[PDB]
Amino acid sequence: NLLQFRNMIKCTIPGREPLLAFSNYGCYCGKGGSGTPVDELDRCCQTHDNCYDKAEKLPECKGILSGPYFNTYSYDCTDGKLTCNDQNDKCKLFICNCDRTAAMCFAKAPYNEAYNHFNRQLCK
Amino acid sequence: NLLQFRNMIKCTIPGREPLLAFSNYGCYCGKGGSGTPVDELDRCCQTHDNCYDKAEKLPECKGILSGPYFNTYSYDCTDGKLTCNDQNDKCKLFICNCDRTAAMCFAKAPYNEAYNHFNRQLCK
Amino acid sequence: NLLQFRNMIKCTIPGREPLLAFSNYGCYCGKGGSGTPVDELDRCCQTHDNCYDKAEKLPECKGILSGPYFNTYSYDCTDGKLTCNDQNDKCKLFICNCDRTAAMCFAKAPYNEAYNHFNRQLCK
Amino acid sequence: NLLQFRNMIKCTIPGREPLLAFSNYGCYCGKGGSGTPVDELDRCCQTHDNCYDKAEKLPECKGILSGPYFNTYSYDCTDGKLTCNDQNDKCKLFICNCDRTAAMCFAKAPYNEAYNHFNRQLCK
Amino acid sequence: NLLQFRNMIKCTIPGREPLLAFSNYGCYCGKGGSGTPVDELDRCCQTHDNCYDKAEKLPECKGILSGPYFNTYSYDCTDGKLTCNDQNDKCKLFICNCDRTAAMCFAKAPYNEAYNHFNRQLCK
Amino acid sequence: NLLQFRNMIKCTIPGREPLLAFSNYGCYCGKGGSGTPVDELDRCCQTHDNCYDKAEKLPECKGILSGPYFNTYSYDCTDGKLTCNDQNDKCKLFICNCDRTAAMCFAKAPYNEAYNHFNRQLCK
Amino acid sequence: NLLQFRNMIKCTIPGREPLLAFSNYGCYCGKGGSGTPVDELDRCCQTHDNCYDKAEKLPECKGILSGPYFNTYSYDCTDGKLTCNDQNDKCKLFICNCDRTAAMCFAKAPYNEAYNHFNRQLCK
Amino acid sequence: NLLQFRNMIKCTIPGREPLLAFSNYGCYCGKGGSGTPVDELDRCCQTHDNCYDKAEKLPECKGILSGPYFNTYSYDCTDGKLTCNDQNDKCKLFICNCDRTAAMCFAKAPYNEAYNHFNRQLCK
Amino acid sequence: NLLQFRNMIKCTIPGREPLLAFSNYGCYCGKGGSGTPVDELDRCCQTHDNCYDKAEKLPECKGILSGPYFNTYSYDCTDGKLTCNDQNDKCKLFICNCDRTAAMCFAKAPYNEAYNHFNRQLCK
Amino acid sequence: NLLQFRNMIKCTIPGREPLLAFSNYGCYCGKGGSGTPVDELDRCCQTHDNCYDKAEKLPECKGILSGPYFNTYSYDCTDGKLTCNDQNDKCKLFICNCDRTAAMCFAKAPYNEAYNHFNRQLCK
Amino acid sequence: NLLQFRNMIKCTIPGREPLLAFSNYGCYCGKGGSGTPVDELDRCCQTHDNCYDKAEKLPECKGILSGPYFNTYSYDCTDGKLTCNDQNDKCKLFICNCDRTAAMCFAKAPYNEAYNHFNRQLCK
Amino acid sequence: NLLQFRNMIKCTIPGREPLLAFSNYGCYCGKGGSGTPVDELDRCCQTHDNCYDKAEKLPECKGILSGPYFNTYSYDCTDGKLTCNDQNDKCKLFICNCDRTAAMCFAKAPYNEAYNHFNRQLCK
Known part of the structure; x- marks a missing residue:
């Protein structure tokens, strides 16, 4: 879920509040980018x-609150490394993997504070 | 067109008024879902x-009123079956199948009054 | 960028103002269509x-104002012919081609004065 | 229904796309008549x-989709003429006549393209 | 006034909270017509x-808050029946009758739960 | 027309600026009604x-700018008395008469300054 | 309810229309102030x-339309005197008193015509 | 946090999706009630x-994301009973107690589906 | 008034322009916080x-321009101290203290550039 | 006034309905400019x-309804020639002259129908 | 600054609250002059x-809070007269004169309460 | 055009992304004045x-897209200097100069980071 993704970022990027840095960054970080x-x-x-977008169409993703925002999956953060532990619910696993890949992707990317709260009318 | 779609639902589901059962059901039934x-x-x-979505991009679909909402196709409902009788117009034939397939899927699936008039804020 | 795109069309269709003929044409011309x-x-x-859509995903396209609307590419128009000059900047070459391809297409296709300033509520 | 209305127009007026000539003409044709x-x-x-307006107050008109826009009546277009064939359902018969009368009125009337795409703020 | 109208309905139909059964029923209940x-x-x-509509036209109706929504009239509900006690003020009498007649009409008419919270888009 | 109605009011009610007193008065004076x-x-x-509302339906009323707001009619204000002079154009004559009886009606009615710019939401 | 409140004021200040004197007065009169x-x-x-504010929190106030704006209480106005008659319904007694207290206060306080239709942007 | 409150409700009220029942109920359940x-x-x-509201002013509640919506506290749900385990961070403890009291309050209250998605204009 | 407030900040904090440091800082500094x-x-x-908030409800605060934003009080800044010299006007004396207290609190507290121009969506 | 300017245009440009051609033309014709x-x-x-803009600053221009929109001036249209006749009121004379030179300017300028209802966002 | 402007008005015009007589008079007094x-x-x-407007283009005017609304100048009001005492800061001196000149213009001019709370749609 | 203007600034000030330093600086940078x-x-x-402002008034400037925002001019940036190459088209020359002069002015003026992302509310 939303909070789990936030915590995954803390795992890959210690000492830095994810909501307070990635919530509204550039053209895609945050809510509905273009x-x-x-x-x-x-x-x-x-x-x-x-x-x-792919998870919403995944055959196994079906049911109330099984959406990426609310769906609680199982994962672990051990020594800066993240693992998705779901075996039964493949929807929770796909979602977990989306967040894992992203958190890890964030960790290998330069962060520019000037791109925070970027005017999105320039994103075309 | 949409009126034809409605009648396809009546064919496979005589016990319901399509506009009261599938107008605002879940996250996708009815006007724009997500x-x-x-x-x-x-x-x-x-x-x-x-x-x-595919119908619009189909090469055979071209010209005014060729869209799924207004494009009139030829089909038949005999004993609750539904047959798409278009052959020369591949666009109309495609849209017809979209409707025949969904209509039979609607009947071959459970209905939950609790999901009718669904709170879509819970869809993300 | 779009301003360059308008001039490419002026390069391929000498006899008209792109903004008066192609910005409210049919269902897709002029952006914001479906x-x-x-x-x-x-x-x-x-x-x-x-x-x-593809340009926004091309790996080579990253950075402030790298989007197809505002990214300024290098090109030329000589004897009704358009040439994209970019070379090492693949992103700005891809966009230049998008506009080039569209301008030559506009020119080869018949223009239907009746479809200009099209309703759009009819595009469903 | 509206789609049937369009076809009634094609009957009395073959050389025209109803949705392009009457969907936005003058102060009353099409949508916001005032x-x-x-x-x-x-x-x-x-x-x-x-x-x-009368159709919606006709005692014989009642029930889901019995409105002029969605109610389907039975009619005929043969060698240029329109015939309303509803007998039992007087609601459809009425709507059908609303459409038939307008269709013949459209054909028997002058067409001024200067009045197409009219600036309705000039209607007051 | 409207608050009195709700109570008149509680008079002729004891169990329902008028605001739950007659606020979004069909195309006309709860104000908003078409x-x-x-x-x-x-x-x-x-x-x-x-x-x-007529009340707003009665010669007898003029002055601040004489409209049917806010004009407080004199009436009584005893043993399940409604009595309009206005005499000296015809306007208050007319309006009181509008609400009385309506409350009795609701009580006599069948209640089709399927039509509650009806989608007005289908009233055309 | 608009300006003529204003002058008709000056004819029946000397000493006032019609646009300064009848612009937003009560619930129907000006633009809005209700x-x-x-x-x-x-x-x-x-x-x-x-x-x-009757003039817009009048058979004689039809043509560009033949609406009450812009249609210039022929009338006379002589010694506080108003006379409508049109004979050839019955639409202008009807409009003139709407303005005339209104102006004369205004003159027989007490003017309360407290009703100026009245909160129209109280008009129900 | 508010309509009753308006009449209570008419009970305590015979010579005026509450809506013309107390709905846009100063910073707080008329609701929506600070x-x-x-x-x-x-x-x-x-x-x-x-x-x-206190009424909305009174334990005795629960249920549809139990709020001070729409809750109809029992009261009387005889010889310029207001009496709240509710007895076992404490909620609807408390609200009646809120309005009673305000109406007597309005009457005892000087009225400053200059503060009517007050700016409010000045209430900070 | 938000999700913890949701889970606390599941603890006191098994078999029933809290977001799908309390998210928009009555005049206060959900977001900003009146x-x-x-x-x-x-x-x-x-x-x-x-x-x-009290937590936002609590001396111990100070810091980024220490708000009720994002602040993650420690609690346990064992056999339908909830316990707040925080000892060090008194802000997390106050917040936990707010949610605990509420979840437990929800469990002792009749739930009416008709009050779900209540028109809040009636909440005054 | 607010200009006086600004100057009180300059007194206790000469090294800053109050409008660049405390205008949009955190969740409460500046226009409406939550x-x-x-x-x-x-x-x-x-x-x-x-x-x-208290100043507005203080009994001594009454009349036009007695609000904290515009009410001018008497105070003094000598050697970075700040003294409220109002005695007869208790309202002005109260507002003055609000400003003196906050001004000294501002100086006797840390400043974090990271919280300046803060994303208030993170305040709940 | 407004209607006079319209007639001045009819004087200099016979065969056109000024409100039908100059209402929303280009970037300055009508209401808006830019x-x-x-x-x-x-x-x-x-x-x-x-x-x-100059008339609003003119010393002679001041009084209720003495603005270009409503100020009725004295002028003549004789054989396609316009003459401003005011001598006593220099504000009416100035306004008349603004309308006169504009009407004459319109008559010397080519009229492109394609510029009607121009997309004013392209005017920067 | 504006508060100083108010006091300058009290100087030349003692028998009036500036914010109640000039903050919404005519078409230019107060806020949206047009x-x-x-x-x-x-x-x-x-x-x-x-x-x-001139004050904002004065070369001598520059820097935070040097605008006419927030810039504090030095002035004097003794036995009814106003004196601008700024010498070094020509920006303040200018603003001060803007205010002094308007204050004396206000006193030396007629006051028409009929023009207070003016309907600015009559300004065109 | 504006896109060219950004590049002229990149010419005279190499390191900054003009959109980050000059888009919300002070009261006038980035368009939106006062x-x-x-x-x-x-x-x-x-x-x-x-x-x-002047450009929009130059006799030499007329036609679709001749405005300073979208009018594409001819210029060059070589060895850190800007050259406007327009000769045949004075309008394009004027605009090109407006941008050139501005780019050189930015480069010469001190950059006070404290004024970036400045609050326009303080410009009064």
Whole structure:
């Protein structure tokens, strides 16, 4: 779920509040992005969006609150490494993997504070 | 067209008024849906949406009123079956199948009054 | 960018103001469209959208103002012929081609004065 | 229903796409009729509007989809003429006549393209 | 006034909270008209609007808060029956009758739960 | 026309600027209408609105700018008395008469300054 | 309810229309206000708000339309004197008192014609 | 946090999706409520609001994301009983207690589906 | 008044322009705040807001321009101290303290550039 | 006034309905202004606007309804020639002259129908 | 600053609350000046507006809070007269004169309460 | 055009992304004026607006897309200097100069980071 993704970011990027840094960044980080990513971080978010889009169509993703925002999956953060532990519910597993890949993608990307709260009318 | 779609539902589901049962059901049945389906029926509607999405991009679909909402196709309902009788117009034939498939999917799926008039804010 | 795109059209269709003939044409011309294209011209605009969609995902396209709307590419118009000059900047080459392809398409397709300033509520 | 109305227009007026010539003409043709008719054609649309208004207060009209826009009646177009064949359902018969009368009024009236795409703020 | 009207309904139909059963029923109940009444109950509401329409035209009705919504009239509910006690003020009498007639009409008409929270888009 | 009605008011009520007193008065004077009139003057405007509604339906009324707002008629104000002079154009004559009886009605009605810019939501 | 409140004021201040004198007065009169009261009258309206605030929290106030705006209480006005008659329904007694107290306050306080239709942007 | 409150409700009320039942109920359950509670459940939500309001002012509640919506506290749900385990962070403890009291309050209150998605204009 | 408040900040904090440092800091500094403070400085602003809230309800605060935003009090800044010299006007004396207290709290508290121009969506 | 300017245009340009051709033309003709004129006609309107801006500053111009929109001046249209006749009221004379030179300017400028209802966002 | 402007008004005009007599008079006094002045007083406000417009382009005016609304100048009001005492800061001196000139213009001009709370749609 | 203007700035000031440093600086940079320029940099922007204002008035500027925002001019940036190559088209020359002058002005003026993302509310 939303909070689990936030915690996954804390796992890959210690000491830095994810909501207070990735919530509204560039053209895709945050809520409903469009256009072209302003950098590598932003593209991580663009890809994250696409993954979620895929989850909504996944055969196994069906049911109340089974959406990426509310669906609670099982994962572990051990020594800066994340593992998705779901075996039975493949929807929770797909979702977990979307967040894992993203959190890890965020960790390998330069973060520019100037791109925070970017005017999205420029994202076309 | 949509009126034909409604009548296709009546064919496979005589016991219901399509506009009261599938107008605002789940996250995909009815005007613009998003998020992930709440159940099997909702999924039928999501798939329907996709089919219409494909219909618009189909090469055979061209010209005014060739869209799934208004394009009139030829079909038949005899003993609750539904047969798409278009052959020369591949566009109309495609849209017809979108409707025949969804209509049979609607009947071959459970209905949950609890998901009718669904709170779509719970779809993400 | 779009301003360059307008001039490319002026390069391929000398006799007209792109903003008066192609910005409210059919279902897709002019951006912000959907549904089924009404004719060949309308398809041109649709494949032009798709093209912009791909540009926003091209790996080579990252950075402030790298989007197809505002990204300034290098090109030339000599003897009714358009040439995209970009070379090492693949992103800005791809966009230049999107616009090039559309401008030549607009020119080869018949123009239907009746489809200009099209309703759009009819594109469903 | 509206789609049937369009076809009734094609009957009395073969050389025209109804949705392109009457869906936005004068002050009453098409959607938001208000003010004074610009011409005889425009008046046909005001009458039509009034007829539909009567249709909704006809004691015989009642139930889901019995409105002029969605109610399907039985009619005929043979060698240029229109015949309303409803007998039992007087609600359909009425709606059918609303449409038939407007269709013949459209054909028997002058067409002024200067009045197409009319600036309705001039209707007051 | 409207608050009194709700109580008149509680008078002729004891168990229901008028605001839950008659606020979004069919095309006309709960104010906001258009379309064709879906059933007898819906008729009652359309007739109720008409009544309010006339009230706003009665010579006897003028002055601040003389409208049917806010004009407080004199009436009584005893042993399940409604009595309009206005004599000296014809306007208050007319309005009180509009509400009385409507309350009795609701009580006599069948209540089709399927039509509650009805989608007005289908009233055309 | 608009300016003529204003002058007709100056003819029947010397010493006032019609646009400064009848612009937003009560519930029907000006632009909007709705509810029950707050007094006689307001009722005069209510009746005026209705007369204008009848002119839009008048057979003689049809042509560009032949609406009450812009249609210039022929009238006379001589010694506080108004006379409508049109003989050839019955639409202009009807409009002139709507303005004339309204102006005369205004003159017989007490004007309450407190009703200026009345909160029209209280008009129900 | 508010309509009853208006009549209570008419009971205590015979010579005026509550809606013309107390709905846009100062900073607090008329609901939807804040800041510092401008005079005694304005304080009356403030303590009337506070009173409504307490009513929404009174344990005895629960149920559809139990709020101070729409809850109909029992009361009487005889010889310029207001009496709240409710007895076993404590909620509807408390509200009746809120309105009673305000109406007597309005009457005892000086009325400042200059503070009517007050700016409010000045209430900070 | 938000999700923890949701899970606390599942603890006190097994078999029933909290977001799908309490998210938009009555006048206070959900987001920013006003007026008077429609029943006991609703008041539980009114009180919950007040508790949160208190937390925002609690001396110990200070810091980024230490708000009731995002602040993750420690609690346990064992055999339908909830316990708040925080000892060090008194802000997390206050918040936990707000949710605990509410979840437990919800469990002792009749739930009416008709009050779900209640028109809040009636909450005054 | 607010200009005086600004100058009180300059007194205790010569090294800053109050409008660039405390205009949009945290969740409470500046125009309308909500949620819980991000830090000690933010808390000073929350407390300030409350003080102003009290100022409005103070009995001694009455009349036009007696609000904290525009009410001018008498005070003094000598060697970075700040002394409220009002004695006869208790309202002005109260507001002055609100400002003196917040001003000294601002100086006796840490400043975090990371919380300046804070994303208030993170305040709940 | 408004209607006079319209008639002045009919004087200089017979065979056209000024409100039907100059209402929303280019970027300055009508109501709005902004940007660069699309041609000479548009420039005439741009200049007109400026003349009106000068009249509002004219010393002689002051009094209720003495603005360009409502101020009735004295002029003559004789054989396609316009003459401003005011001598006593210099404000009416100035206004008349703004309308006169504009009407004459319109007559010397080519009228492009394609510029009607121009998308004013392209005017920057 | 504006508060100083108010006091300058109290100087030349002791028997009036500036915020109640000039904050919404005519077409220019107070806030959204546009159109033609209704009277001499109204003109004083248009001039004032123009002066402030000049103040913002004065080369001597620059920096935070140097605008006419927030910039504090030094002035004097003794036995009814106003004296601008700024010498070094020519920006303040200018603003001060803008205010002084308007204040004396207000006093030396007629006051028409009929023009208070003016309907600015009559300004065109 | 604006896109060219951004590049002219990249010419005279290599390291900054113009959109990050000059889009929300002071009161005038980034379009949207009013107030008094805060510093030399802000002056540059105000002067730039003025320039655009004049451009919209140059006799030499007419036709679709001749405005300073979208009018594409001919220029060159070589070895850190800007050259406007327009000769045949004075309008394009004027605009090109407006941008050139501005770019050079930005480069010469001090950049006060504290004024970036400045609150326009303080420009009054």
